[PDB]
Enzyme design. Sequence first.
Site, PDB file in Angstrom:
ATOM      1  N   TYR A  44       4.651 -56.786   7.836  1.00 15.48           N
ATOM      2  CA  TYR A  44       4.413 -55.752   8.826  1.00 15.48           C
ATOM      3  C   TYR A  44       5.159 -56.037  10.125  1.00 15.48           C
ATOM      4  CZ  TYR A  44       1.844 -52.653  12.022  1.00 15.48           C
ATOM      5  OH  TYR A  44       1.494 -51.705  12.957  1.00 15.48           O
ATOM      6  N   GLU A  45       5.265 -57.335  10.430  1.00 15.42           N
ATOM      7  CA  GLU A  45       5.903 -57.816  11.653  1.00 15.42           C
ATOM      8  C   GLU A  45       7.395 -58.108  11.462  1.00 15.42           C
ATOM      9  OE1 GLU A  45       3.152 -61.090  12.276  1.00 15.42           O
ATOM     10  OE2 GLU A  45       1.837 -59.898  13.537  1.00 15.42           O
TER      11      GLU A  45
ATOM     12  N   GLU B 106      -5.220 -65.324  15.928  1.00 17.04           N
ATOM     13  CA  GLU B 106      -3.891 -65.604  15.397  1.00 17.04           C
ATOM     14  C   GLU B 106      -3.324 -64.464  14.525  1.00 17.04           C
ATOM     15  OE1 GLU B 106      -1.422 -67.925  15.914  1.00 17.04           O
ATOM     16  OE2 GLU B 106      -0.367 -66.595  14.533  1.00 17.04           O
TER      17      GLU B 106
ATOM     18  N   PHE C 107     -11.436 -46.943   8.371  1.00 15.06           N
ATOM     19  CA  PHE C 107     -12.712 -46.829   7.753  1.00 15.06           C
ATOM     20  C   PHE C 107     -13.736 -47.686   8.461  1.00 15.06           C
ATOM     21  CE2 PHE C 107     -10.551 -44.024   5.215  1.00 15.06           C
ATOM     22  CZ  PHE C 107      -9.868 -44.510   4.071  1.00 15.06           C
ATOM     23  N   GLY C 108     -13.338 -48.266   9.590  1.00 15.46           N
ATOM     24  CA  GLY C 108     -14.238 -49.140  10.326  1.00 15.46           C
ATOM     25  C   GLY C 108     -14.066 -50.644  10.090  1.00 15.46           C
TER      26      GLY C 108
ATOM     27  N   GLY D 241     -11.490 -52.930  10.634  1.00 16.87           N
ATOM     28  CA  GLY D 241     -10.927 -53.704  11.750  1.00 16.87           C
ATOM     29  C   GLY D 241     -11.918 -53.804  12.910  1.00 16.87           C
TER      30      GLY D 241
ATOM     31  N   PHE E 291      -4.532 -63.120  22.375  1.00 18.55           N
ATOM     32  CA  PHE E 291      -3.765 -62.798  21.143  1.00 18.55           C
ATOM     33  C   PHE E 291      -2.457 -62.137  21.531  1.00 18.55           C
ATOM     34  CE2 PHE E 291      -7.146 -59.762  21.893  1.00 18.55           C
ATOM     35  CZ  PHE E 291      -6.520 -58.547  21.985  1.00 18.55           C
TER      36      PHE E 291
ATOM     37  N   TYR F  56      -6.279 -51.859  20.798  1.00  7.97           N
ATOM     38  CA  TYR F  56      -6.879 -52.967  21.564  1.00  7.97           C
ATOM     39  C   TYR F  56      -7.220 -52.525  22.979  1.00  7.97           C
ATOM     40  CZ  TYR F  56      -5.660 -56.788  18.285  1.00  7.97           C
ATOM     41  OH  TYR F  56      -5.499 -57.649  17.237  1.00  7.97           O
TER      42      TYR F  56
ATOM     43  N   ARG G 139      -8.094 -49.538  23.942  1.00  9.91           N
ATOM     44  CA  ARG G 139      -9.346 -48.784  23.879  1.00  9.91           C
ATOM     45  C   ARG G 139     -10.611 -49.654  23.784  1.00  9.91           C
ATOM     46  NH1 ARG G 139      -5.694 -44.747  21.482  1.00  9.91           N
ATOM     47  NH2 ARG G 139      -5.658 -45.782  19.442  1.00  9.91           N
TER      48      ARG G 139
HETATM   49  C1  ACO Z   1      -3.224 -60.915  15.924  1.00  7.82           C
HETATM   50  C2  ACO Z   1      -2.981 -59.615  16.194  1.00  7.82           C
HETATM   51  O1  ACO Z   1      -3.806 -58.955  17.035  1.00  7.82           O
HETATM   52  S1  ACO Z   1      -1.670 -58.852  15.453  1.00  7.82           S
HETATM   53  C3  ACO Z   1      -1.771 -57.088  15.546  1.00  7.82           C
HETATM   54  C4  ACO Z   1      -2.886 -56.507  14.666  1.00  7.82           C
HETATM   55  N1  ACO Z   1      -2.469 -56.079  13.331  1.00  7.82           N
HETATM   56  C5  ACO Z   1      -1.627 -55.090  12.998  1.00  7.82           C
HETATM   57  O2  ACO Z   1      -1.050 -54.446  13.869  1.00  7.82           O
HETATM   58  C6  ACO Z   1      -1.384 -54.743  11.519  1.00  7.82           C
HETATM   59  C7  ACO Z   1      -1.664 -53.216  11.212  1.00  7.82           C
HETATM   60  N2  ACO Z   1      -3.039 -53.232  11.544  1.00  7.82           N
HETATM   61  C8  ACO Z   1      -4.107 -53.637  10.977  1.00  7.82           C
HETATM   62  O3  ACO Z   1      -4.071 -54.019   9.763  1.00  7.82           O
HETATM   63  C9  ACO Z   1      -5.346 -53.754  11.912  1.00  7.82           C
HETATM   64  O4  ACO Z   1      -6.472 -54.625  11.701  1.00  7.82           O
HETATM   65  C10 ACO Z   1      -5.723 -52.502  12.570  1.00  7.82           C
HETATM   66  C11 ACO Z   1      -5.183 -52.983  13.922  1.00  7.82           C
HETATM   67  C12 ACO Z   1      -4.834 -51.361  11.932  1.00  7.82           C
HETATM   68  C13 ACO Z   1      -7.221 -52.231  12.702  1.00  7.82           C
HETATM   69  O5  ACO Z   1      -7.939 -52.082  11.472  1.00  7.82           O
HETATM   70  P1  ACO Z   1      -8.676 -50.729  10.966  1.00  7.82           P
HETATM   71  O6  ACO Z   1      -9.617 -51.070   9.863  1.00  7.82           O
HETATM   72  O7  ACO Z   1      -7.567 -49.729  10.809  1.00  7.82           O
HETATM   73  O8  ACO Z   1      -9.593 -50.372  12.291  1.00  7.82           O
HETATM   74  P2  ACO Z   1     -10.846 -49.367  12.284  1.00  7.82           P
HETATM   75  O9  ACO Z   1     -10.799 -48.595  10.974  1.00  7.82           O
HETATM   76  O10 ACO Z   1     -12.153 -49.970  12.626  1.00  7.82           O
HETATM   77  O11 ACO Z   1     -10.429 -48.457  13.522  1.00  7.82           O
HETATM   78  C14 ACO Z   1      -9.225 -47.708  13.600  1.00  7.82           C
HETATM   79  C15 ACO Z   1      -9.581 -46.313  14.159  1.00  7.82           C
HETATM   80  O12 ACO Z   1     -10.355 -45.521  13.236  1.00  7.82           O
HETATM   81  C16 ACO Z   1     -11.604 -45.123  13.829  1.00  7.82           C
HETATM   82  N3  ACO Z   1     -12.677 -45.256  12.832  1.00  7.82           N
HETATM   83  C17 ACO Z   1     -12.675 -46.130  11.827  1.00  7.82           C
HETATM   84  N4  ACO Z   1     -13.789 -45.987  11.090  1.00  7.82           N
HETATM   85  C18 ACO Z   1     -14.491 -45.020  11.646  1.00  7.82           C
HETATM   86  C19 ACO Z   1     -15.786 -44.419  11.303  1.00  7.82           C
HETATM   87  N5  ACO Z   1     -16.459 -44.888  10.222  1.00  7.82           N
HETATM   88  N6  ACO Z   1     -16.245 -43.419  12.097  1.00  7.82           N
HETATM   89  C20 ACO Z   1     -15.536 -43.011  13.168  1.00  7.82           C
HETATM   90  N7  ACO Z   1     -14.345 -43.533  13.494  1.00  7.82           N
HETATM   91  C21 ACO Z   1     -13.800 -44.544  12.750  1.00  7.82           C
HETATM   92  C22 ACO Z   1     -11.872 -46.096  14.974  1.00  7.82           C
HETATM   93  O13 ACO Z   1     -12.637 -45.537  16.056  1.00  7.82           O
HETATM   94  C23 ACO Z   1     -10.468 -46.476  15.392  1.00  7.82           C
HETATM   95  O14 ACO Z   1     -10.008 -45.572  16.367  1.00  7.82           O
HETATM   96  P3  ACO Z   1     -10.219 -45.837  17.934  1.00  7.82           P
HETATM   97  O15 ACO Z   1      -9.026 -46.694  18.309  1.00  7.82           O
HETATM   98  O16 ACO Z   1     -10.189 -44.419  18.436  1.00  7.82           O
HETATM   99  O17 ACO Z   1     -11.589 -46.429  18.003  1.00  7.82           O
HETATM  100 CA    CA Z   2       0.055 -64.264  13.717  1.00  8.76          CA
END
Ligand code: ACO
Ligand code: CA
EC number: 2.3.1.57
Lengths: 164, 164
Positions: free
Chosen positions: B25-26, B90, B101-102, B104, B125, B138, B140
């Site tokens: 991804y990176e 990390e 889906f919630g 992350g 991070f 992040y 938000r």
């Molecule tokens: C170390 C580091 O920090 S590196 C950078 C992080 N990683 C990446 O960039 C790789 C790509 N990303 C990922 O794989 C990540 O973990 C992420 C960053 C995409 C987050 O994981 P996700 O499971 O997609 O997050 P999640 O599903 O909880 O939330 C994403 C959005 O969907 C919404 N959402 C998810 N589930 C629900 C639900 N059940 N009901 C309502 N809203 C929901 C959330 O509110 C969120 O939106 P927001 O920003 O408006 O709150």
């Molecule tokens: Ca890393």
Amino acid sequence: AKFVIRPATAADCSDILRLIKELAKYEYQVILTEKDLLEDGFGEHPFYHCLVAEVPKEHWTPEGHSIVGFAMYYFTYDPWIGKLLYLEDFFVMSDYRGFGIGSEILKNLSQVAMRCRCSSMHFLVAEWNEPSINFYKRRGASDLEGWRLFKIDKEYLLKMATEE
Amino acid sequence: KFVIRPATAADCSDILRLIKELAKYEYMEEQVILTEKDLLEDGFGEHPFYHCLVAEVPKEHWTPEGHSIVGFAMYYFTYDPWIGKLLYLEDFFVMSDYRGFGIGSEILKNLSQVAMRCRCSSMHFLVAEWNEPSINFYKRRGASDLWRLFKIDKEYLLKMATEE
Ligand SMILES: CC(=O)SCCNC(=O)CCNC(=O)[C@H](O)C(C)(C)COP(=O)(O)OP(=O)(O)OC[C@H]1O[C@@H](n2cnc3c(N)ncnc32)[C@H](O)[C@@H]1OP(=O)(O)O
Ligand SMILES: [Ca+2]
Ligand SMILES: CC(=O)SCCNC(=O)CCNC(=O)[C@H](O)C(C)(C)COP(=O)(O)OP(=O)(O)OC[C@H]1O[C@@H](n2cnc3c(N)ncnc32)[C@H](O)[C@@H]1OP(=O)(O)O
Ligand SMILES: [Ca+2]
Ligand SMILES: [Ca+2]
Ligand SMILES: [Ca+2]
Ligand SMILES: [Ca+2]
């Protein structure tokens, strides 16, 4: 003039804070207390490790201190390569520099890395800090997208910890 | 339909799989030279050098290939001598088909509870400047955006370790 490098003990914590604050001063405040330092380093889970340079009574500071240098380190993990030694603070009191204390701490740090099987030792150095840059470079140090440091503070951690 | 839980040693093949998918991804999957055996040794021996949380789905939601682990976070503690203990995130990754889906958010709740239990003042991070979705993810949640890194490799460390 002569010295010993050894692991810090709990009774060293007051000297550790004094040297953390002297290094901060050199780089530039410090809000850590002796009690934090004590709990964080010598409690059940040490969050940092410290090596300390100790001089005989003959060479104690004008203020009466036996500890004239230190290094604070901890381990980090690079998920692409493996464990690293991370050198956080590294300081010798201005009047005791140049006589080999620094080099001896770095030998001891080097030993820790090999015992602990670290592939590398990582550390930050300020741009302006020329004597330290050259000192490290002499010893093998190389310098290392564009990835930004973000932080989430405890008020927001509390919010997430305590929402359901 | 998912649980967030601490990783176990039996999860190491999944952790490496998701480490590699995040590096892809990176744009840097070729950098991953870590093995499942390293992960096991470094994570699930006498001294863990990282901690991991994993997102497991039930049978009905397993990936097409059959995997039950669809997300993870890898963390360790670092120490800021001015302030105290920090939780350092990390790696953080959820498989594309399982984002939204919630998962992350729930991983981040669990990380925030680790920070609270451990009394960390902040979680730190790195986020790539190009990585807009995650930057806003992040921000938000309270994230704030906020000196050269040197290394000394194994051979130079061994050199310093073994000299008089
Ligand atoms: C170390 C580091 O920090 S590196 C950078 C992080 N990683 C990446 O960039 C790789 C790509 N990303 C990922 O794989 C990540 O973990 C992420 C960053 C995409 C987050 O994981 P996700 O499971 O997609 O997050 P999640 O599903 O909880 O939330 C994403 C959005 O969907 C919404 N959402 C998810 N589930 C629900 C639900 N059940 N009901 C309502 N809203 C929901 C959330 O509110 C969120 O939106 P927001 O920003 O408006 O709150
Ligand atoms: Ca890393
Ligand atoms: C914190 C971090 O993670 S990075 C920042 C490192 N810390 C600092 O910069 C704080 C200020 N500096 C210091 O406290 C110390 O100089 C340290 C820790 C960098 C080194 O410790 P010292 O005990 O001085 O090291 P040591 O005596 O082994 O050797 C220092 C070298 O500088 C030279 N040197 C040091 N002081 C002098 C002096 N007053 N006059 C001439 N030469 C000097 C020595 O000749 C020696 O040379 P070498 O590179 O050829 O071996
Ligand atoms: Ca420092
Ligand atoms: Ca070790
Ligand atoms: Ca497995
Ligand atoms: Ca803890």
